Design a protein around this ligand. Structure first.
Ligand SMILES: *[C@@H]1O[C@H](CO)[C@@H](O[C@@H]2O[C@H](CO)[C@@H](O[C@@H]3O[C@H](CO[C@H]4O[C@H](CO)[C@@H](O)[C@H](O)[C@@H]4O)[C@@H](O)[C@H](O)[C@@H]3O)[C@H](O)[C@H]2NC(C)=O)[C@H](O)[C@H]1NC(C)=O
Ligand SMILES: CC(=O)N[C@@H]1[C@@H](O)[C@H](O)[C@@H](CO)O[C@H]1O
Ligand SMILES: CC(=O)N[C@@H]1[C@@H](O)[C@H](O)[C@@H](CO)O[C@H]1O
Ligand SMILES: CC(=O)N[C@@H]1[C@@H](O)[C@H](O)[C@@H](CO)O[C@H]1O
Ligand SMILES: CC(=O)N[C@@H]1[C@@H](O)[C@H](O)[C@@H](CO)O[C@H]1O
Ligand SMILES: CC(=O)N[C@@H]1[C@@H](O)[C@H](O)[C@@H](CO)O[C@H]1O
Ligand SMILES: CC(=O)N[C@@H]1[C@@H](O)[C@H](O)[C@@H](CO)O[C@H]1O
Ligand SMILES: CC(=O)N[C@@H]1[C@@H](O)[C@H](O)[C@@H](CO)O[C@H]1O
Ligand SMILES: *[C@@H]1O[C@H](CO)[C@@H](O)[C@H](O)[C@H]1NC(C)=O
Lengths: 462, 132, 132, 132, 51, 51
């Protein structure tokens, strides 16, 4: 015999969890000035070790496009960002008629540097001072209903009030090694090949995820991890034209950007307390924002991708083209290098096609040949489409330069009924979710479910 | 390799060792599951909920007996509808993960039966106290 | 009708069934009493307090013995000043609600007595461990 | 003078009475350690943490046995490296405060040993249930 | 009532962190109590006066 | 004076500012000890100790 039941407390089994993770900040970004560091001040420092498991003979099903964790991450960033900017720099007083004139004109990117004057509030409310500053992107808009006159308005006067930034705050990504609450555990795939979904067989436990530095970017993704062995091409559905292809490159590429012009800064006190910052001058020469990338490395990459891509799109030529078109926020590459916000036209990074031979032929040379992209810099941006969270950049005094170890790719697919011999791949992006999804996918969060039952046949005397 | 620390300080390591393995290790698993502006709410909720879960499980363990031994006999026989496997198969080949995929049915049946056999024992003990 | 679920998942249903009825049912009552921007504080406070109440009661139960059986003999005799009713009257006619209206006096007397008889037992057990 | 209320409702009063004194009093000490806009967080955190500490200690007590008696024998012998004092010296002259200054070493050694002797007992009991 | 009997202990006033808790709260309590009232910004206009 | 500094407030006119003693209490699990000793330099081994 007769079988008798026994209860087993603490059995090692699990079920899918629907919970939240937390900082877990890195405990190295902490110094007195941490109170001036975005998304670090708010967080708790920790120092946990890596896990040994190795779950042996256990296998499990993962699915990147169903991992709700990304939404937690998305929502917090929106809310953390906004909260950090509340106690400062309201720019409402700025929205007055602006009077201005042409730089030099000449180069379209220099013409923009308008000498701008205005009348504003002095320490004593009763008085106004005539003052000036430099502005240049059409954040300065010809005044509605004027006729080619010197009168302009700010771009956000037919929208909502904006802020600048608390000037003290540092915006630099710090990896957060997100940890599970008690009762939860995190599992990860150590497997290569992995499509984004399926029965991973090399599975390890995680106490805390490997920390990931958040980045805001589109199209080409910077400061991420590299594929360990080979390029990985990943997509929710390869046959669905509405989906975005995520590509993990094997080897790094280096990008060097800069804003070469010696710039100055000035500030104006507006009414009580708060000062406003703007560009003072630019001492004589003419700038061009730009990004230099080695061509060598670039061509090598595109063909290697094409080779792997060929597996899902066999016996066809791979062609690259430009974006669909739209506002720079839609079509250009976006960087926050140095805290400045850049928009970089992809033209002619994706001006090519490769014959479906993808021959990996190159040679040694003393060539340093590069592709140079040009950029534009804005002053007012809609942070993550946060029109209601619009903000004006602080100016920075300098010959700003920027490195990065790159890149992750975000790509889409095109081609009509008039091809099917070739397919066209275009730059894609815009959803912050994928920017993190790209790396977050490694982890699944599960709940430990103690207390199970089994027969034994043994019985209690009583 | 690993060892108990990684398996049970960390979790679910023994899932791949089959259930007989568990008899020597299910200790640590339990203790490490009880560890410890607006984010203050998020953190407080997490802490409270972990405690609530713990306590609720303790309540059932208490009710059914025995219960401080973690492995208890409740003197309830098995229904034959649940005897489609050999005991050796269960203990030597199957995992808890695996067993749990099928034995998951009839959850409340078992709980009902456990509660009642304990109630019966308790009455008999009260009569013995009264008789003695 | 009703049944245990309504009586004890729900509460106080047995209050009208007289206290002898309780001997077969006071189980569920306990388990269902342990369930689970600014409103976040209101909710957290409620949750915490429910836990605190539970735990404090468990602490006394532990201290006095026995205690996992829910019904325990503590080997303390009754003071004759508390023997103004027959036992049959108490168990068959009276309710807990009713008993509790009068027996409410001398609350701490009972607690004091319970704590001490348990202390005495414990010393004797320690001596037996030492002797053996 | 003082008495148990001040000594253990209040705390650490017996620290000056040497450890043998403790055998008659370590009761109340435990129960009174479990008592109960932005300040709402401060208060909630305090309450939660007190609960967490309590429960974590209960978890270890449970794991090692015995454990509801507050004073338990675990059937683990002493290592001779820890036998540099007479038992009478320990119980009649030393305080807990004092003992604790030196005996503080090897904390985890003791815990490891306690956990394991309990595990061994449990296996033997499971075999006896199976044999019987 | 205690009176810790035969117990003695080491104290150190200049290391008692408690004071900082006290300091910090006073600063924050004071400030919070004055938020919902009397903003004086409109007052800052040219003032005219005599002896 | 505060036009080359930051905006100021006056006071909520209803609020009383008068020191009230706070008899600070410990959370469960904690206890407070005090020195009943005279002489005491601000530091050292107080022998008259109370809870
Ligand atoms: C990013 O890419 C940019 C675009 O190429 C780089 O610009 C190159 O930067 C180098 C260094 O400033 C400039 O070098 C100048 O080179 C000329 C040599 O060219 C002249 O002589 C050669 C002989 O072969 C002849 O072939 C040319 O036609 C010219 O007659 C030197 O004369 C200069 O004194 C200086 O070395 C390149 O001109 C420049 N290309 C430009 C300006 O577009 C840029 O450096 C890369 N990295 C950065 C930092 O942006
Ligand atoms: C939100 C809103 O009213 N925006 C108007 C927009 O309609 C118009 O296009 C713009 C000039 O393009 O000025 C502003
Ligand atoms: C490596 C791998 O899993 N390959 C998968 C294949 O299993 C799956 O059939 C396909 C669509 O489901 O996506 C890819
Ligand atoms: C659909 C089709 O014609 N398939 C051909 C395949 O037979 C050939 O082996 C491959 C490379 O040579 O190119 C493709
Ligand atoms: C928004 C933007 O700059 N995109 C430009 C596109 O306008 C231009 O046609 C192309 C060639 O100049 O370069 C890129
Ligand atoms: C900051 C950073 O990652 N830079 C790295 C550099 O350290 C590394 O040596 C190179 C490959 O060796 O890849 C890139
Ligand atoms: C903070 C600031 O600007 N203060 C100025 C201070 O420099 C100057 O001394 C004062 C008259 O003494 O007027 C105000
Ligand atoms: C009453 C008393 O403690 N006197 C102390 C003395 O002990 C100590 O040496 C000195 C500096 O440490 O400060 C004072
Ligand atoms: C802008 O106009 C002002 C008027 O004083 C002039 O003094 C200043 O030089 C001009 N700034 C530039 C960039 O020319």
């Amino acid at each position: 015999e007769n079988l008798w039941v026994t209860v087993y407390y603490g059995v090692p089994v699990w079920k899918e969890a629907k919970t939240t993770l937390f900082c877990a900040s890195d405990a190295r970004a902490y110094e007195k000035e941490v109170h001036n560091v975005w998304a670090t001040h708010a967080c708790v420092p920790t120092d946990p070790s890596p896990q040994e498991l190795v779950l042996g003979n256990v296998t499990e099903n993962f699915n990147m496009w169903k991992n709700d964790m990304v939404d937690q991450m998305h929502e917090d960033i929106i809310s953390l960002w906004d909260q950090s900017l509340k106690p400062c720099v309201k720019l409402t007083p700025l929205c007055v008629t602006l009077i201005c004139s042409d730089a030099t004109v000449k180069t379209g990117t220099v013409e923009e540097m308008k000498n701008c004057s205005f009348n504003t509030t002095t320490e004593i409310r009763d008085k106004e001072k005539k003052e000036y500053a430099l502005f240049y992107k059409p954040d300065i808009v010809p005044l509605s209903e004027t006729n080619n006159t010197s009168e302009y308005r700010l771009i956000n006067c037919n929208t909502s009030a904006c802020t600048q930034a608390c000037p003290k705050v540092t915006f630099e990504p710090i990896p957060i090694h997100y940890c599970a609450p008690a009762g939860y555990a995190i599992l990860k795939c150590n497997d290569e090949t992995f499509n984004g979904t399926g029965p991973c067989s090399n599975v390890s436990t995680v106490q805390c995820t490997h920390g990931i530095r958040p980045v805001v970017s589109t199209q080409l993704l910077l400061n991420g991890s590299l594929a360990e062995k080979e390029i990985v091409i990943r997509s929710e559905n390869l046959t669905n034209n509405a989906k975005i292809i995520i590509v993990h490159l094997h080897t790094p590429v280096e990008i060097v950007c800069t804003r070469p012009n010696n710039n100055t800064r000035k500030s104006v006190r507006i009414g009580p307390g708060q000062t406003f910052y703007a560009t003072g001058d630019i001492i004589g020469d003419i700038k061009q924002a730009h990004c230099n990338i080695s061509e060598e490395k670039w061509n090598d990459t595109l063909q290697k991708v094409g080779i792997e891509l060929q597996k899902h799109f066999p016996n066809k030529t791979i062609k690259y083209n430009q974006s669909a078109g739209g506002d720079m926020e839609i079509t250009t590459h976006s960087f926050n290098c140095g805290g400045e916000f850049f928009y970089c036209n992809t033209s002619n990074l994706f001006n090519g096609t490769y014959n479906g031979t993808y021959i990996s032929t190159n040679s040694s040379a003393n060539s340093t040949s590069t592709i140079t992209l040009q950029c534009r810099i804005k002053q007012i941006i809609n942070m993550w489409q946060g029109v209601g969270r619009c903000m004006y950049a602080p100016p920075i005094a300098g010959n700003i330069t920027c490195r990065s170890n790159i890149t992750g790719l975000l790509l889409t697919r095109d081609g009509g009924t008039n091809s099917n011999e070739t397919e066209t791949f275009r730059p894609a992006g815009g959803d912050m979710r994928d920017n993190w999804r790209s790396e977050l996918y490694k982890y699944k969060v599960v709940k430990i479910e103690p207390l199970g039952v089994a027969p034994t046949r043994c019985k209690r005397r009583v | 390799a690993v060892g108990i620390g990684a398996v049970f300080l960390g979790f679910l390591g023994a899932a791949g060792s089959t259930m007989g393995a568990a008899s020597m290790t299910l200790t640590v698993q339990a203790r490490n599951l009880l560890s410890g502006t607006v984010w203050g709410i998020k953190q407080l909720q997490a802490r409270v909920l972990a405690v609530e879960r713990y306590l609720r499980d303790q309540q059932l363990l208490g009710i059914w007996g025995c219960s401080g031994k973690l492995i208890c006999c409740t003197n309830v026989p098995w229904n034959s509808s649940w005897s489609n496997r050999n005991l050796s198969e269960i203990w030597d080949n199957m995992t808890w993960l695996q067993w749990d995929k099928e034995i998951s049915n009839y959850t409340q049946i078992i709980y009902g039966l456990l509660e009642e056999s304990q109630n019966q024992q308790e009455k008999n003990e009260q009569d013995l106290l009264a008789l003695d």
